[PDB]
């Protein structure tokens, strides 16, 4: 009897979700293709073995990325 409220609510929530997906897509996907570092690294004495990807990992995370991931009911709701 109350008419059309839930259409408005669902439309608003769907718009929010699509906006979040668009934000995540826009922030990161700034490059057309994907590059890869050469296996041998000689960066003029500089060291980058903490932020570059480490193959010895189930995922492709790096050391600082892993450290950040560590720092941060489930189904009742």
């Amino acid at each position: 009897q109350y008419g059309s409220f839930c259409t408005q609510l669902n439309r608003a929530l769907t718009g929010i979700a699509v906006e979040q997906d668009k934000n995540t897509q826009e922030v990161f996907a700034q490059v057309k293709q994907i590059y890869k570092t050469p296996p041998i690294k000689d960066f003029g004495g500089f060291n980058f073995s903490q932020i570059l990807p480490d193959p010895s990992k189930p995922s492709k995370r790096s050391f600082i990325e892993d450290l950040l991931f560590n720092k941060v009911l489930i189904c009742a709701q």
């Binding site: 669902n10 769907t14 009911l73 009742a76």
Partner: protein, 326 residues
């Protein structure tokens, strides 16, 4: 992609398990009582540990007026009661409309009141044939005056002389003093409304303790892993009943355990801590190309296993049908 017509699983059967029947509640002797006391000396009775069928009483036309407030009488037999509070008395018919809570009157305020949240049922029936006395049934008395109106469900029996003024009352009767009790005039010559009326009231509480007063039970079984309708002790719900490792004290029932929902609960007739889990649900979605191009569509069930639903490919977000993986 479009999200329409959220999906859910319908129930299949019902379980109406109830504890063992014991006997019939002896309310008939209350309703067929020999003598009824005065208003201030009302007959107060507690009925517990029995099984009562109020359908016969409801279908019986022996009574005159019958008002159920907190519950609809038709389904009165589908609720289990912890305890029964039966209060009986005899009142003048003209004053009968004082029985309801929130009313204003002499007996309704001075010596008999009801709580605002009262949930019981009231019955009033004329008994002029047997309760009336040819010389006058003056055994019934009442408090004409009271210093302070009493709270609901408390008995006042004091024989104090009325004190209508600040001046002291001396002797049996003093200044502005009168007898605490006045007799009721009940004679066969009394007209309609002046005849005596037997008035009874029934009160009960809900879910605070494992109840003992119920009706027909028709307990069947304890089937598991099925979307069934459970009505164990009044709580009607839909879901699946499993076995849980959760521990109860020897007196714990009706666990909420998260915010407000009836979690894993014990069962009647036995001692096992069963667990209640809601049926599967999800929001189905339709993915389609341009309808100008073609007409074939695909259906995605979100976040639910589709090993049961009535070229599938189950994914993380849910499972997709109508399309083939590459």
């Amino acid at each position: 992609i479009y999200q329409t017509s959220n999906f859910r699983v319908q129930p299949t059967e019902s379980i109406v398990r109830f504890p063992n029947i014991t006997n019939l509640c002896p309310f008939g002797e209350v309703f067929n009582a020999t003598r009824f006391a005065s208003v201030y000396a009302w007959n107060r009775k507690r009925i517990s540990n029995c099984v009562a069928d109020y359908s016969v009483l409801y279908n019986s036309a022996s009574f005159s007026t019958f008002k159920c407030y907190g519950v609809s009488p038709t389904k009165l037999n589908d609720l289990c009661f912890t305890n029964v509070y039966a209060d009986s008395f005899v009142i003048r018919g003209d004053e009968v409309r004082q029985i309801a809570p929130g009313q204003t009157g002499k007996i309704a305020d001075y010596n008999y009141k009801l709580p605002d949240d009262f949930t019981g049922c009231v019955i009033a029936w004329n008994s002029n044939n047997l309760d009336s006395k040819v010389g006058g049934n003056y055994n019934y008395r009442y408090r004409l005056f009271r210093k302070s109106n009493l709270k609901p469900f408390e008995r006042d029996i004091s024989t104090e002389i009325y004190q209508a003024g600040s001046k002291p009352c001396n002797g049996v009767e003093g200044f502005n003093c009168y007898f605490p009790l006045q007799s009721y005039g009940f004679q066969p010559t009394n007209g309609v409304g002046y005849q005596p009326y037997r008035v009874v009231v029934l009160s009960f509480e809900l879910l605070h303790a494992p109840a003992t007063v119920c009706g027909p039970k028709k307990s069947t079984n304890l089937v598991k892993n099925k979307c069934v309708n459970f009505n164990f002790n009044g709580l009607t719900g839909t879901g699946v009943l499993t076995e849980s490792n959760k521990k109860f004290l020897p007196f714990q029932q009706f666990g909420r355990d998260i915010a407000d929902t009836t979690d894993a609960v014990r069962d009647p007739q036995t001692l096992e801590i069963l667990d209640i889990t809601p049926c599967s649900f999800g929001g189905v979605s339709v993915i389609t190309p341009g309808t100008n191009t073609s007409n074939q569509v695909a259906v995605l069930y979100q976040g639910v296993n589709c090993t049961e639903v009535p070229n599938v490919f189950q994914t993380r977000a849910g499972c997709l049908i109508g399309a083939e993986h590459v």
